[PDB]
Amino acid sequence: MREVISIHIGQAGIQVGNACWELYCLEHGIQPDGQMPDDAFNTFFSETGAGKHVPRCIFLDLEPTVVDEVRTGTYRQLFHPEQLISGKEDAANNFARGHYTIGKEIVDLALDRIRKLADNCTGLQGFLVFNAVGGGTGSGLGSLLLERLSVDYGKKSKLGFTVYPSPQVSTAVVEPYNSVLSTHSLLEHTDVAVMLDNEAIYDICRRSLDIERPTYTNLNRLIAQVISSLTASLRFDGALNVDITEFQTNLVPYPRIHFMLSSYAPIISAEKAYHEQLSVAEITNAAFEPASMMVKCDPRHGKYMACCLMYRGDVVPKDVNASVATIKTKRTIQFVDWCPTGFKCGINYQPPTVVPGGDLAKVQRAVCMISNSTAIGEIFSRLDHKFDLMYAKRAFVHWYVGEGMEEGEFSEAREDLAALEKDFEEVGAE
Amino acid sequence: MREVISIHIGQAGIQVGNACWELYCLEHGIQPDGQMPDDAFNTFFSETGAGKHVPRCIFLDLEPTVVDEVRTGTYRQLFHPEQLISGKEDAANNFARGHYTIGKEIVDLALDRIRKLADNCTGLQGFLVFNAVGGGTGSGLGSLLLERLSVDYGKKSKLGFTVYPSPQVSTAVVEPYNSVLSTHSLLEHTDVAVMLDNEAIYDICRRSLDIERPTYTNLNRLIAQVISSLTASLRFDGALNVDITEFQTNLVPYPRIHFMLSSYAPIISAEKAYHEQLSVAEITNAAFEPASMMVKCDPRHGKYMACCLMYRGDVVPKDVNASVATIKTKRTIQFVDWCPTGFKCGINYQPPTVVPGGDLAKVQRAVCMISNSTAIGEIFSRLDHKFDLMYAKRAFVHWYVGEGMEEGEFSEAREDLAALEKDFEEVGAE
Amino acid sequence: THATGRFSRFWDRYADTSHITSVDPCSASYAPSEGTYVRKGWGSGDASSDFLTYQGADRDQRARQRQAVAVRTTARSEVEAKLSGLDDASGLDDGRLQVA
Amino acid sequence: MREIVHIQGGQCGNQIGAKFWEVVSDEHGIDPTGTYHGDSDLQLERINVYFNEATGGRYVPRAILMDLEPGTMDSVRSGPYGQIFRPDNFVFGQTGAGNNWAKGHYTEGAELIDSVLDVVRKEAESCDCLQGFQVCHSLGGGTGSGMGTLLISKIREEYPDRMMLTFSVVPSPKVSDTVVEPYNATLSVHQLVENADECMVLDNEALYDICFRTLKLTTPTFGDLNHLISAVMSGITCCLRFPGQLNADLRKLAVNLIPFPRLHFFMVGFTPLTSRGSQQYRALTVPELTQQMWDAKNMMCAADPRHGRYLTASALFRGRMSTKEVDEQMLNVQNKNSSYFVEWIPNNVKSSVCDIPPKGLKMSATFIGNSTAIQEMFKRVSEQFTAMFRRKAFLHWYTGEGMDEMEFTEAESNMNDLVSEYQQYQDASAE
Ligand SMILES: Nc1nc2c(ncn2[C@@H]2O[C@H](COP(=O)(O)OP(=O)(O)OP(=O)(O)O)[C@@H](O)[C@H]2O)c(=O)[nH]1
Ligand SMILES: Nc1nc2c(ncn2[C@@H]2O[C@H](COP(=O)(O)OP(=O)(O)OP(=O)(O)O)[C@@H](O)[C@H]2O)c(=O)[nH]1
Ligand SMILES: Nc1nc2c(ncn2[C@@H]2O[C@H](COP(=O)(O)OP(=O)(O)O)[C@@H](O)[C@H]2O)c(=O)[nH]1
């Protein structure tokens, strides 16, 4: 009745989906084969007459390798074979390639399977789209898919957990280009966009988990924990239930402003676990710590507009109220003048499950802080000059033009991002 | 974490490096093959995944014979083959030959390997440069390498354990010439220079070890013991730890005045061992004895500027305080008026390991006293007349000019050494 | 036998040329075949750890360093216990008193 | 399922291709008879990128061999892995090109090119999806340079969208083998600029220097240089063949490497190259691999990067590694050597990670550097070409093969224009 359809686009999307679905299977007790030894799985799994549970997900990629890895791994009997969709040619970090030439037939088939999945859901809370801003598959095909979803499904709540390029460290060169293009695309399509930065999550793993060599598996595990905490209110009952529809109502001040910083707490290894109290106030303070942000964006620069707090485990409303009162009284944290409350608390009685082989410890309390704040304009400011720095010489522009784009598209995307900067400045200003 | 890069230049540098690395292998249990049957070796050795340990050392020489002796001896499987750098033509005791014509390509390759060595070190306490002032390789190439190190690495502490010509006994004729040149070079590059004299160490061996026929192996063993005592605080824990960076803070009052006398105690054969108590006070008195100096420079002529003691073995702060109080009360030991304390005591719990095949006995206590004193101006005064006596007749000046030097270089070196004399006199005077 | 008459008189043309990836087993570079072919192993925690050897290697290095430090500290603390046990209570002058 | 059509041209190209196919068959566990003996599923998972299944378990390389003399193809057939190739893909003429680009491009190459294109079309149509073609050959030789450029032009005409990758052995700076190397190189570079999408420049003297200084070999035959080249050729496409933590195909590398269409020449290097003596002494960490990778001596191009400016640089790492460690190493290199990296590109490194290292090695890394340093190589080739062309030495053979003298001027002008572009982006200032 509370079904949520998951979409994973690109290598990053599929690799975070692996962690997400491992976490969901461990949380609901579903074995990798597909079946488990009430109805809390309906949000993520649909059961068949045989008793086997198949996830309501769609793994989309234009490259065969990542999807074939899932087809060969442990979860080969879990996912639907046609739900795993593989392309033939990779988008090659090209937004034009993933949006205009290669992405067409793939997105058509993706909408076909998405319609088939949604036809099996009584209710539908929304879509959880996990892609990579900075790659042709993630940016271009993801943008096209989101546009088609907006056209056909309409008002269904699409939550995009996007990974944006880190400020200094990066793995691609055309990353500012296709990131700007995808941001222009999704400014008008996704309902709530959550920013994620690999640099910030690397720092989180290095400091909190004491992993001197963090990797994509650890990053995806942390992101999966964040998403599971975000969705726990759909699957398990508790005081102060918060819903997908309530996220926008209590977090988005205006339709343009829906990009959100995410932070999980606690992030502590087993050896360092059970050395601190991990009370509600302490974990809330840790969640509000700027270092704990999963985005390289210091919130002290901006002003918080809304903050949704998802508590898991032995959490009581008196403790959440005391912690939030202390947070409000703290001088470092600053809220906008036109939002007196700016807080949306939701508690759940299910503690976060621990993935065997992971680094996170078994903690009885957890917080996921998702905040809309005007500080997020900083990352767009960085990408806006990283874009125009290359765009001045028109470097790598022929690559994008060759697959059916125009210089006008680059100009429009840059102008739209400038307008987004201006809107953030305006909403921040009194 | 506390890595120190060792450079050994010339025949004397490599020959003392042989003793130093034999002592380090014996101290850490590292077999000559390379591997041992924690992380105390990291200061001097870098370990590979195979468990084999390779020293962070560089054997630089323009002569092939000395390095090939290492390549053929027992430690052929220990040292890094490319780290052993061999020249084709010897410098022929010519500072110009080793500094202007032959030394160029060799020092380029040396900086290449030094960059490779330093890139493998997380931390870097500094460099230990062991050269021979008084030979073309040691003086010229050593000066060039020190200048390049100062240019590129910058603030890394370079401790130069230099060997100056003895007052009366010597083996070369142009030794005053290239010694003056190298002194002018290293007055402005090395951070802490340690003075050494073969005559003084010969006297130590003859009087204390009762060796009527001391040789270079004995001298290098004593020098290796001194350096190991100096670096023991980096590898082994103990009360009052001392650091390479702390040598500069607690030993050199001024950048110009950084030349230091070194003295070890006890120097006793096993025949004379266990005939005396060898208490802390007695070994401190022996260390402050002028005959125990490894430089032919009577400290009575000058005044002590600073004195760093490094104790090894069963030494307690109460005993070291009693010994230092007695030393301060002693009238023959004289300190400058502007340095009331002038003492830097540091203890280590690791007794000095005894080299099988050496003449030193196994002593549970050891002292290494490194002292800045104004008396050291005497040796420069000796070289300054030994130099100008030859320079008046311009003997062997054609040899130096033939490889691209000028009379101006000799004049500048002489003037700089005179300025150093004047500085020593000024700091000695009230 | 499949070689034609030309280029079979001299087989020195087709040398081993295996100096690339010629890393000796004793070298730190060597990796066995079972070590090369490994998957991410999302489903199995053991498989994930096998993929992430370097994290496990770092954990083991830290554990070994801490254990060595603990052993050294225990031995040393026994040493100061023996040293500080010496006081007026210990019979240091008992022999002198007996002789007198 | 993203197939690559390999093509070998001339004696040097055929030798390099034979060594490359030996290396790839060893990596995939393919014995010289073609049967699979690798005992690993990942080896057979993506074997179809390079090989096709025969009647039995035999696997045939998707390679097409060209020559004007049958001797080199007899040698390739007689080599240890000579029996994997299908005999029909051996296309040979009868009279070789006398180191004459004109002979290999116009007179003798014209007749054989029809059969060459027939074989290429036959191999490409069998492919499900075609990533593109990789052509290994040597600039400065008649049949190699000439027929290679002609075939590259033909394949560009037939398959414009498909990737074209070239491994060209540019004549070495100091020691030259043949006299007409400047002529052949000048004529071939002009063709590669217009046709080749992606081109690695390789030098026998760079290979000799690296095998003397890094590998410290004593008597390095051409097999060793071919083996280094083959290691690079494998490492470039290992992301297509093996699962990767952050995979990157040929098109992705080309996109992230090529800022402008004409600036598609690269210097490549393979790590870790360790001398037999220092193999135990070296410890393989990602920083060690990066330090050897960015060294100028490791580059297999004669031009040293220190003179030029890195426009872009891709690094394909292989082995169980930390993506954070790799990215941190790349960022640290960029920050330390920011003077050597172009300012108007904020990030000049395309980092890729593959989960399967080469056999025996714990980790490896191949490098592709697009830097303005290659300007000096083309400049030196010009310095020889213009000197010889002023007096028109050896011009009479090229004229007697039926190609105009104005073609030399056009090729020289194009190569000088490429040099000018490289200099322009070397000294280009932001804003
Ligand atoms: N946080 C995180 N980011 C990832 C992960 N894997 C990939 N990314 C990011 O995803 C971006 C590229 O993703 P994709 O577009 O899917 O790469 P691809 O599948 O080859 O598709 P194209 O790059 O468009 O050709 C990179 O810039 C990475 O920063 C991951 O596991 N975790
Ligand atoms: N203390 C000590 N000094 C040494 C030893 N061996 C050589 N020396 C000194 O080193 C000086 C010359 O050293 P080098 O410059 O290295 O001699 P080389 O290797 O032939 O190089 P060049 O003489 O410069 O051409 C001599 O004057 C000796 O006094 C040694 O084993 N111990
Ligand atoms: N790396 C490498 N270079 C070679 C080999 N054989 C020849 N060369 C070089 O390639 C250059 C061109 O020769 P090539 O093009 O093969 O002659 P062609 O086949 O008649 O055109 C010569 O100058 C050789 O120095 C080889 O096996 N490996």
Side-chain angles (χ1 to χ4, degrees), chain A residues 1-275 277-430, chain B residues 1-275 277-430, chain C, chain D:
Chain A
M1 185 64 72
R2 307 150 311 268
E3 298 90 337
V4 173
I5 300 170
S6 308
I7 313 186
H8 298 94
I9 307 160
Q11 176 154 39
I14 295 175
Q15 283 176 168
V16 305
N18 284 308
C20 287
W21 283 112
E22 159 161 45
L23 187 55
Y24 308 148
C25 290
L26 282 157
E27 204 152 341
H28 291 113
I30 288 175
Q31 298 193 253
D33 53 13
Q35 82 281 358
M36 65 179 288
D38 297 358
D39 203 33
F41 55 84
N42 216 318
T43 302
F44 285 126
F45 298 82
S46 65
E47 59 89 21
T48 57
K52 186 188 144 177
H53 315 259
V54 65
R56 47 187 77 257
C57 183
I58 190 167
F59 273 20
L60 201 63
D61 191 18
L62 314 175
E63 210 174 345
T65 43
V66 193
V67 193
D68 291 352
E69 184 185 335
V70 182
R71 285 162 178 154
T72 307
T74 71
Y75 307 104
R76 81 178 75 78
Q77 288 283 293
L78 177 66
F79 294 99
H80 197 292
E82 190 277 331
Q83 274 171 17
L84 282 72
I85 302 158
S86 300
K88 306 188 76 74
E89 278 282 313
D90 202 15
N93 279 340
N94 193 356
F95 180 91
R97 204 161 162 79
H99 194 95
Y100 291 85
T101 76
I102 284 180
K104 314 313 300 301
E105 68 277 17
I106 303 298
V107 75
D108 219 352
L109 195 149
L111 276 296
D112 172 20
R113 175 46 56 183
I114 284 157
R115 186 34 63 74
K116 285 180 187 303
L117 264 173
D119 285 353
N120 211 16
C121 306
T122 62
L124 193 49
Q125 298 294 331
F127 298 81
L128 288 183
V129 186
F130 299 164
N131 72 340
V133 176
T137 52
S139 68
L141 179 65
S143 49
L144 186 47
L145 174 47
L146 278 181
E147 172 194 2
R148 301 292 273 273
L149 289 184
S150 299
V151 171
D152 61 359
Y153 282 93
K155 315 315 304 194
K156 280 313 192 303
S157 45
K158 299 166 292 302
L159 271 70
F161 284 71
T162 59
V163 174
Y164 265 71
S166 298
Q168 40 197 299
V169 74
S170 68
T171 187
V173 181
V174 297
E175 200 167 339
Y177 272 31
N178 44 18
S179 284
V180 166
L181 269 297
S182 51
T183 297
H184 168 70
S185 70
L186 62 83
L187 182 49
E188 61 194 322
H189 287 135
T190 187
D191 286 33
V192 163
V194 182
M195 301 305 78
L196 286 82
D197 285 334
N198 283 357
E199 204 177 322
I201 309 170
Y202 278 146
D203 184 74
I204 288 178
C205 289
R206 195 205 86 247
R207 282 180 319 89
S208 308
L209 292 164
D210 290 331
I211 301 180
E212 292 298 327
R213 273 143 181 76
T215 187
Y216 285 166
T217 76
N218 305 140
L219 308 182
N220 304 348
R221 283 196 218 282
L222 259 65
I223 303 169
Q225 278 290 344
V226 168
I227 299 144
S228 172
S229 59
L230 192 138
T231 313
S233 60
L234 271 299
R235 292 162 298 135
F236 319 112
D237 69 306
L240 308 192
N241 281 321
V242 181
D243 292 330
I244 294 294
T245 68
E246 320 190 336
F247 291 165
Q248 305 94 333
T249 69
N250 285 286
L251 278 164
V252 180
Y254 315 101
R256 287 285 300 264
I257 303 101
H258 57 268
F259 309 91
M260 293 180 184
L261 302 184
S262 66
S263 78
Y264 203 84
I267 320 291
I268 44 168
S269 64
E271 51 275 10
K272 264 292 162 203
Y274 58 79
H275 266 265
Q277 282 210 325
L278 277 296
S279 84
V280 177
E282 307 305 320
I283 63 190
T284 311
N285 285 14
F288 278 99
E289 288 284 349
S292 78
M293 295 298 102
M294 293 177 71
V295 168
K296 277 295 300 301
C297 173
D298 199 9
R300 275 93 51 76
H301 292 126
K303 299 187 162 215
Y304 284 97
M305 271 175 308
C307 299
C308 178
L309 294 174
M310 293 300 85
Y311 287 75
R312 294 195 64 169
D314 183 33
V315 182
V316 58
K318 71 153 189 294
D319 280 356
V320 74
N321 287 346
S323 71
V324 75
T326 52
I327 285 291
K328 295 219 83 177
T329 55
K330 198 178 304 309
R331 182 250 170 180
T332 316
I333 310 302
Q334 181 59 35
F335 287 78
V336 290
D337 307 345
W338 39 274
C339 198
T341 61
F343 265 112
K344 171 55 179 179
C345 302
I347 307 167
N348 196 290
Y349 292 153
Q350 177 61 32
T353 181
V354 65
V355 173
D359 204 8
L360 291 181
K362 180 67 174 66
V363 293
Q364 63 192 343
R365 292 178 265 277
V367 187
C368 180
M369 201 288 307
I370 170 167
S371 50
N372 206 339
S373 160
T374 179
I376 67 179
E378 174 163 317
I379 73 172
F380 299 108
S381 296
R382 308 190 307 246
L383 282 71
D384 285 331
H385 70 85
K386 290 170 92 83
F387 174 94
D388 60 32
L389 190 56
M390 311 165 48
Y391 196 51
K393 312 295 168 178
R394 276 86 169 93
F396 313 97
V397 162
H398 62 109
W399 284 117
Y400 290 66
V401 168
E403 277 87 4
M405 200 176 294
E406 293 279 357
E407 288 262 39
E409 309 298 302
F410 279 98
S411 189
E412 282 164 37
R414 182 57 190 90
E415 293 307 318
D416 191 1
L417 261 64
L420 183 62
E421 277 181 319
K422 181 262 291 180
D423 296 0
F424 281 132
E425 281 319 315
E426 170 176 18
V427 297
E430 171 199 326
Chain B
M1 283 73 74
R2 308 147 309 267
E3 299 88 338
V4 174
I5 297 171
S6 309
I7 314 187
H8 298 95
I9 305 161
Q11 175 150 39
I14 296 176
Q15 284 178 346
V16 305
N18 286 308
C20 288
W21 285 112
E22 165 159 46
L23 184 53
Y24 302 148
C25 289
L26 281 156
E27 208 153 342
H28 296 113
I30 289 175
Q31 297 193 253
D33 54 14
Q35 80 281 359
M36 55 205 304
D38 297 1
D39 209 36
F41 55 86
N42 215 318
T43 303
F44 283 130
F45 305 87
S46 66
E47 61 91 21
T48 58
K52 200 205 188 215
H53 315 254
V54 65
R56 48 187 76 260
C57 182
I58 170 170
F59 272 16
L60 201 62
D61 188 16
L62 313 177
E63 211 173 345
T65 61
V66 176
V67 194
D68 289 353
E69 185 184 336
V70 180
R71 283 160 181 150
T72 309
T74 72
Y75 307 102
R76 81 177 75 77
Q77 285 283 294
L78 176 63
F79 293 99
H80 196 289
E82 190 277 332
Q83 274 168 18
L84 282 72
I85 302 158
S86 300
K88 307 185 77 74
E89 277 281 314
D90 204 15
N93 284 163
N94 194 356
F95 180 92
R97 204 163 162 79
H99 192 90
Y100 289 84
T101 78
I102 285 180
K104 315 312 300 301
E105 67 279 15
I106 302 297
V107 77
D108 219 353
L109 196 149
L111 276 296
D112 172 20
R113 177 47 59 181
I114 285 158
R115 291 306 336 287
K116 287 181 188 304
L117 262 174
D119 287 353
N120 210 16
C121 305
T122 62
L124 192 52
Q125 299 293 331
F127 296 80
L128 289 184
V129 188
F130 298 165
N131 69 340
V133 159
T137 51
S139 70
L141 182 60
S143 50
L144 191 46
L145 175 46
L146 279 178
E147 175 194 3
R148 300 291 274 273
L149 287 186
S150 299
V151 170
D152 61 359
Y153 281 93
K155 65 202 60 52
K156 284 316 193 304
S157 45
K158 300 165 293 302
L159 271 71
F161 284 70
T162 60
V163 179
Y164 292 97
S166 298
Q168 40 196 300
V169 74
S170 68
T171 187
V173 183
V174 301
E175 201 166 341
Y177 271 27
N178 47 16
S179 285
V180 166
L181 269 297
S182 49
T183 295
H184 167 69
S185 70
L186 62 83
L187 182 50
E188 60 196 322
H189 287 133
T190 188
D191 285 33
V192 166
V194 183
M195 302 305 78
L196 285 84
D197 285 333
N198 280 355
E199 204 176 322
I201 305 170
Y202 281 144
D203 184 74
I204 289 178
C205 292
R206 182 194 200 66
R207 213 189 75 265
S208 308
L209 292 164
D210 293 331
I211 301 180
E212 297 296 327
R213 271 146 176 76
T215 187
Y216 283 163
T217 78
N218 305 320
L219 309 183
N220 304 349
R221 283 196 220 281
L222 261 64
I223 304 168
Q225 281 289 344
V226 169
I227 299 145
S228 171
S229 59
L230 186 135
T231 313
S233 62
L234 272 298
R235 295 158 298 137
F236 318 111
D237 69 306
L240 283 72
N241 280 322
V242 187
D243 291 331
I244 295 293
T245 70
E246 292 293 299
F247 292 165
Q248 191 273 325
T249 65
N250 279 286
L251 281 173
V252 294
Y254 313 103
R256 281 82 65 193
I257 301 100
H258 56 265
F259 311 91
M260 322 276 298
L261 301 183
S262 66
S263 80
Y264 204 82
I267 320 291
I268 47 167
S269 63
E271 293 79 356
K272 208 166 290 299
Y274 57 77
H275 264 265
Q277 282 53 62
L278 277 296
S279 84
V280 176
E282 308 306 319
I283 61 190
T284 310
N285 288 14
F288 280 97
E289 290 286 349
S292 77
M293 305 285 119
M294 317 195 165
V295 173
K296 276 295 300 301
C297 172
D298 198 9
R300 276 92 55 79
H301 295 128
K303 300 186 162 214
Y304 289 98
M305 294 177 71
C307 298
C308 176
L309 306 152
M310 296 134 288
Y311 287 76
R312 295 197 64 168
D314 182 32
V315 182
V316 298
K318 314 152 161 153
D319 278 356
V320 72
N321 286 344
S323 71
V324 74
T326 52
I327 285 291
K328 293 224 83 177
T329 55
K330 295 298 215 302
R331 54 221 161 280
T332 314
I333 310 301
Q334 176 60 37
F335 287 84
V336 290
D337 306 346
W338 36 270
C339 196
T341 55
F343 264 112
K344 170 56 179 180
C345 301
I347 310 165
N348 198 291
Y349 291 157
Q350 177 64 30
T353 183
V354 65
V355 173
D359 202 8
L360 293 180
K362 58 179 290 294
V363 292
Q364 64 188 342
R365 294 181 264 275
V367 184
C368 181
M369 197 261 299
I370 173 165
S371 48
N372 207 339
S373 161
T374 178
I376 65 183
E378 173 164 318
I379 73 172
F380 300 109
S381 297
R382 309 191 305 246
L383 282 71
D384 285 330
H385 72 86
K386 293 172 93 83
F387 175 84
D388 60 32
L389 186 54
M390 293 177 70
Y391 195 50
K393 310 295 169 177
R394 276 89 170 95
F396 315 97
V397 163
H398 64 109
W399 285 115
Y400 287 60
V401 166
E403 277 87 5
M405 262 194 57
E406 293 279 356
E407 286 262 39
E409 310 299 302
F410 280 100
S411 189
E412 283 164 38
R414 184 57 189 90
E415 294 307 318
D416 194 1
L417 262 64
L420 182 63
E421 279 179 320
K422 181 262 291 180
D423 296 0
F424 277 127
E425 282 320 314
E426 169 176 17
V427 298
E430 173 197 327
Chain C
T1 54
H2 66 90
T4 62
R6 280 276 303 214
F7 311 90
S8 185
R9 183 60 60 185
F10 305 111
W11 197 248
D12 294 333
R13 182 186 282 266
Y14 310 94
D16 63 358
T17 74
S18 299
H19 317 291
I20 305 296
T21 193
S22 63
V23 291
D24 299 347
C26 66
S27 174
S29 182
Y30 183 84
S33 64
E34 69 272 17
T36 63
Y37 306 118
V38 64
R39 299 162 185 269
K40 298 179 186 175
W42 290 102
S44 171
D46 177 41
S48 176
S49 303
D50 297 347
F51 179 78
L52 304 173
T53 61
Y54 62 92
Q55 301 179 0
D58 295 352
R59 295 186 192 104
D60 300 347
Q61 284 161 11
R62 204 152 50 67
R64 276 169 288 178
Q65 291 158 356
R66 287 180 177 182
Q67 291 152 14
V69 164
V71 168
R72 293 179 66 188
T73 50
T74 50
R76 179 54 57 175
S77 89
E78 293 172 358
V79 174
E80 292 84 4
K82 304 162 189 143
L83 295 178
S84 75
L86 306 174
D87 62 8
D88 292 331
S90 53
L92 313 174
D93 283 8
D94 274 8
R96 184 196 322 272
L97 267 54
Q98 291 163 6
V99 167
Chain D
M1 61 79 71
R2 292 156 296 173
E3 271 83 347
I4 286 179
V5 175
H6 182 91
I7 305 159
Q8 319 164 28
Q11 167 197 0
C12 165
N14 286 303
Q15 296 279 12
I16 293 179
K19 185 61 68 175
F20 159 74
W21 282 112
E22 171 178 332
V23 162
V24 176
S25 310
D26 204 30
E27 186 177 2
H28 285 287
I30 283 182
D31 73 334
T33 68
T35 58
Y36 170 83
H37 295 285
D39 198 13
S40 185
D41 180 36
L42 291 177
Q43 295 190 353
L44 287 166
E45 185 66 27
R46 303 287 184 193
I47 210 169
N48 61 73
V49 173
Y50 281 138
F51 303 92
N52 319 312
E53 192 152 353
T55 61
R58 200 203 194 80
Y59 280 108
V60 287
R62 198 177 298 106
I64 296 150
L65 304 97
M66 294 182 286
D67 203 351
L68 295 181
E69 61 270 19
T72 73
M73 303 175 112
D74 277 310
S75 61
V76 165
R77 260 188 283 103
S78 68
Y81 281 80
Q83 304 301 327
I84 54 181
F85 312 101
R86 172 189 297 89
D88 192 61
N89 290 353
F90 290 85
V91 185
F92 54 80
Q94 301 315 334
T95 48
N99 296 116
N100 195 343
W101 193 89
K103 280 181 78 68
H105 197 87
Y106 286 113
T107 74
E108 306 184 342
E111 299 87 6
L112 210 69
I113 208 65
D114 314 328
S115 312
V116 169
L117 276 296
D118 288 331
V119 175
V120 169
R121 268 192 300 283
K122 183 185 290 189
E123 292 276 7
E125 68 96 18
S126 87
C127 298
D128 196 1
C129 182
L130 188 52
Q131 191 57 244
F133 309 76
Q134 60 178 355
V135 186
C136 59
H137 63 101
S138 57
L139 308 197
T143 187
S145 302
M147 262 185 58
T149 54
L150 178 55
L151 178 60
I152 287 164
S153 304
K154 298 283 194 204
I155 297 183
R156 173 65 58 193
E157 176 170 18
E158 288 207 302
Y159 307 100
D161 63 358
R162 305 264 68 80
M163 211 55 38
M164 177 66 78
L165 175 47
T166 306
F167 296 88
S168 281
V169 178
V170 166
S172 68
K174 204 171 149 272
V175 66
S176 303
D177 190 1
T178 75
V179 184
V180 290
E181 286 181 352
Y183 277 169
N184 308 334
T186 303
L187 295 156
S188 296
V189 164
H190 167 61
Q191 295 292 323
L192 294 192
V193 165
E194 300 288 342
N195 297 138
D197 270 4
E198 176 169 10
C199 174
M200 321 315 178
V201 162
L202 299 179
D203 307 305
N204 280 294
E205 277 186 317
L207 288 168
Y208 280 134
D209 276 18
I210 191 171
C211 83
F212 301 164
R213 186 144 53 239
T214 69
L215 290 165
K216 286 185 175 58
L217 260 61
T218 59
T219 75
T221 61
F222 269 130
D224 302 333
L225 307 197
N226 296 351
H227 203 289
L228 274 73
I229 295 174
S230 69
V232 164
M233 311 188 64
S234 89
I236 300 304
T237 60
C238 294
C239 286
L240 292 171
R241 312 193 312 279
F242 295 118
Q245 190 170 180
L246 182 45
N247 63 187
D249 60 313
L250 284 179
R251 195 184 300 277
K252 185 183 287 185
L253 294 171
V255 160
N256 288 133
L257 273 160
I258 299 169
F260 307 92
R262 293 176 58 94
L263 293 91
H264 60 71
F265 296 82
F266 315 120
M267 41 185 97
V268 290
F270 179 74
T271 59
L273 296 192
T274 66
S275 63
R276 183 36 75 73
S278 67
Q279 276 199 323
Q280 306 104 302
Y281 301 93
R282 263 202 64 178
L284 282 71
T285 66
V286 185
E288 268 296 322
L289 272 72
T290 58
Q291 173 57 47
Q292 189 185 359
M293 191 155 48
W294 290 100
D295 186 18
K297 313 306 172 297
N298 180 239
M299 318 302 315
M300 281 185 228
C301 182
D304 68 88
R306 264 185 310 277
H307 297 173
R309 274 208 171 191
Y310 274 108
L311 277 159
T312 61
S314 67
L316 298 100
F317 293 89
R318 294 179 66 189
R320 287 191 313 268
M321 296 184 322
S322 164
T323 48
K324 166 63 178 307
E325 183 178 1
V326 175
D327 272 343
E328 175 193 348
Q329 286 307 318
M330 301 295 78
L331 172 66
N332 170 44
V333 167
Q334 275 192 205
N335 286 349
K336 256 293 170 194
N337 297 132
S338 53
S339 61
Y340 286 142
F341 284 95
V342 176
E343 188 196 341
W344 43 270
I345 298 172
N347 300 302
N348 296 304
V349 168
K350 168 55 181 78
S351 179
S352 175
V353 181
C354 197
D355 290 29
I356 297 308
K359 303 211 316 190
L361 283 154
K362 181 201 162 59
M363 285 152 31
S364 82
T366 177
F367 176 86
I368 297 169
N370 193 0
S371 78
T372 71
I374 298 169
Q375 175 190 4
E376 71 183 358
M377 184 179 288
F378 293 123
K379 276 202 298 172
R380 157 171 43 79
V381 179
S382 312
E383 293 251 6
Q384 307 194 287
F385 176 86
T386 50
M388 203 159 73
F389 196 53
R390 195 176 309 112
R391 285 283 282 269
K392 305 193 166 299
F394 320 104
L395 190 56
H396 73 279
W397 292 293
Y398 296 75
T399 311
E401 304 321 285
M403 51 166 258
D404 303 308
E405 186 267 6
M406 283 73 74
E407 290 198 45
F408 282 81
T409 64
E410 186 176 0
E412 177 202 342
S413 300
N414 199 309
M415 196 170 104
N416 279 340
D417 288 5
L418 177 61
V419 167
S420 85
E421 307 284 356
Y422 272 119
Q423 191 70 79
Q424 167 58 33
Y425 298 117
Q426 173 165 13
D427 301 327
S429 54
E431 300 187 353

